[PDB]
Homo-oligomer: A and B are copies of this chain.
Amino acid sequence: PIVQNLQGQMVHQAISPRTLNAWVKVVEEKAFSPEVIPMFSALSEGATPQDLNTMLNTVGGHQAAMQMLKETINEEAAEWDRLHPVHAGPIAPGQMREPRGSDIAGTTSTLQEQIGWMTHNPPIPVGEIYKRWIILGLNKIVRMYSPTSILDIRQGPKEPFRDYVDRFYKTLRAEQASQEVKNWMTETLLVQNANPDCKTILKALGPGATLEEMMTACQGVGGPGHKARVL
């Protein structure tokens, strides 16, 4: 991808092998977790298609997941051949001709060509669009990965509050749903998926009690709360 600002006009360098090794290593231990998605967004300096495509192609084990990302890229590219500029076609000689849907990615565009329209006239954000398509594919993958749904989780009698809460939050990252729905749901959901022993104090928090307020009390009573009768 293109890098270099201080010395002047950008140069097309390849992604570091140390970064490439780190990417392969992360996939070994964190195969499908949602926590890897912002890491990818953060370190992808210059979202140049073939360079990024090479990262997908160097993945080990669960390569089947990469094939799903490729189908998503092709599908959004197919959408880009209709809803977005499909155009007249013809263009004057000595111009970069502008990209079609499959030209956004690495499918029909040669690597030098990709760099050209990202450096000659004001940049075409083909990499940003390609990155967005990969993120859309990742959203489908995490949703498919998640084993339990929101109402499936119901705390056992010998299970503690923290285990139940960890499972809920792990699940919540992969739900692919709106923040407003989450906040509105949060008021009633926490009491509903709890066990009978933990429910007593959890339900006692009452009106206007937020997560900090609830957690402070829950760490005070400890474990899964106490029994239903003192005798």
- Whether A63 pairs with B173 at a CB distance below 8 angstroms is yes
Tell me the residues in window 180-231 of chain A with beta carbons closer than 8 Å to chain B beta carbons.
180-181, 184-185, 188, 192, 196-197, 199-201, 203-204, 206, 210-212, 215-217, 219-221, 225-231
Return chain B residues, CB-CB under 8 Å to A55. 42
- Whether A228 pairs with B57 at a CB distance below 8 angstroms is no
Nearest chain B CB to A189's CB is how many angstroms away? 10
Once A170-B64, A180-B180, A225-B231 are accepted as A-B contacts, the answer to whether A58 and B42 lie under 8 Å apart by CB is yes
Q: Which residue of B lies closest to A151 (CB)?
A: B192
- Whether A231 pairs with B201 at a CB distance below 8 angstroms is yes
Q: Which residue of B lies closest to A29 (CB)?
A: B60
Counted per complex, copies of this chain come to 6
Residues of chain A whose beta carbon lies under 8 Å from any beta carbon of chain B: 4-22, 24-25, 30, 33, 35, 38-39, 41-45, 51, 54-55, 57-64, 67-68, 71-72, 75, 140, 143-144, 146, 151, 165-166, 168-170, 172-173, 178, 180-181, 184-185, 188, 192, 196-197, 199-201, 203-204, 206, 210-212, 215-217, 219-221, 225-231
Interface of A is mostly: helix
Return chain B residues, CB-CB under 8 Å to A230. 200, 203-204
Return chain B residues, CB-CB under 8 Å to A146. 219
14 A-B residue pairings within 8 Å (CB atoms): A5-B11, A6-B11, A13-B45, A18-B22, A35-B59, A42-B51, A61-B166, A63-B166, A151-B192, A180-B181, A184-B185, A196-B226, A200-B225, A227-B231
